[PDB]
């Protein structure tokens, strides 16, 4: 059973507050249902994974759906470069998440390595790409721009 404390506090500080509060709120039952849905995967896409979740839990399914629709609409407003970055960042974050469901949770060095890559991809974008991303994701843009992500990653 995954516990919120399993994630280092300084990595949780890099996550947007809505994502942090979603995870912090999880009951023991919520975590069982998330793990069972993940284990009954893989799925065609995120939407199919959420539909399977809603079947087990209309309430947790609706909570996940609300977060997902907000992220999906923010990505839809991006130009091709910032969309590519956001989608690659999500793929990296999902691989980290997969490790908390399956055996052997990521180490702090594994998390530092994932942030280091996401930051590198952020820095690889043009200024127009960074500005486009920042308009939709101001918390994450600030984590990158302030040096907060670099401090965690170690560099
Ligand atoms: C990241 C916001 C939550 C998104 C919806 C799925 C939540 C269930 C995940 C449980 C395992 C915790 C994973 C922590 C690492 C990470 O979120 O990147
Ligand atoms: C069952 C938990 C999964 C919910 C994850 C919600 C937070 C991440 C949102 C990013 C969506 C990316 C676009 C959809 C791509 C796809 O369907 O493969």
Measured between alpha carbons, how far is residue 102 from residues 7, 95, 97, 108, 134 in Å?
15, 11, 9, 17, 33
Is the distance from the beta carbon of residue 71 to the nearest atom of ligand 2 less than 6 Å?
yes
- Determined by X-ray
Is the distance from the beta carbon of residue 60 to the nearest atom of ligand 2 less than 6 Å?
no
- H, E, C per residue of the chain: CCCHHHCCHHHHCCCCHHHHHHHHHCCHHHHHHHHHHHHCCCCCCHHHHHHHHHHHCHHHHHHHHHHHHHHHHHHHCCCHHHHHHHHHHHHHHHHHHHHHHCCCCCCHHHHHHHHHHHHHHHHHCCHHHHHHHHHHCHHHHHHHHCCHHHHHHCC
First to last CA, the chain: 32
8: left (phi over 0), alpha (psi -120 to 50) or beta: beta
Of the candidates 17, 16, 18, the one whose C-alpha atom is nearest the C-alpha of residue 144 is 16
What is the span of the domain harbouring residue 136?
A: 2-155
CA distance 70 to 32: 25
All residues at 6 or more sequence positions from 123 whose CB lies less than 8 Å from its CB, including other chains: 144
Q: Supply the residue whose CA is at minimum distance from atom 16 of ligand 1.
A: 97
- Number of compact structural domains in the chain: 1
Contact 1, 31 (CB under 8 A): yes
Contact 119, 76 (CB under 8 A): no
Task: Give residue ranges with CB within 6 A of ligand 1.
Answer: 2, 7, 19, 22-23, 34, 64, 67, 93, 96-97, 100
Q: Supply the residue whose CA is at minimum distance from atom 12 of ligand 2.
A: 72
């Amino acid at each position: 059973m995954f516990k919120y404390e399993d994630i280092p506090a300084d990595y949780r500080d890099l996550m947007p507050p809505e994502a942090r509060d979603f995870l912090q709120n999880l009951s023991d039952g919520d975590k069982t249902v998330l793990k069972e849905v993940f284990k009954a995967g893989p799925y065609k896409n995120t939407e199919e994974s959420i539909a399977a979740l809603k079947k087990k839990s209309p309430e947790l399914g609706a909570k996940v759906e609300k977060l997902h629709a907000m992220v999906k609409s923010k990505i839809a407003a991006l130009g091709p470069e910032a969309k590519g970055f956001a989608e690659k960042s999500i793929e990296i974050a999902r691989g980290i998440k997969a490790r908390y469901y399956t055996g052997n949770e990521p180490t702090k060095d594994d998390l530092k390595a994932s942030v280091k890559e996401v930051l590198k991809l952020y820095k690889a974008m043009s200024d127009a790409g960074k500005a486009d991303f920042g308009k939709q994701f101001p918390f994450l843009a600030k984590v990158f721009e302030s040096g907060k992500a670099a401090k965690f990653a170690g560099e």
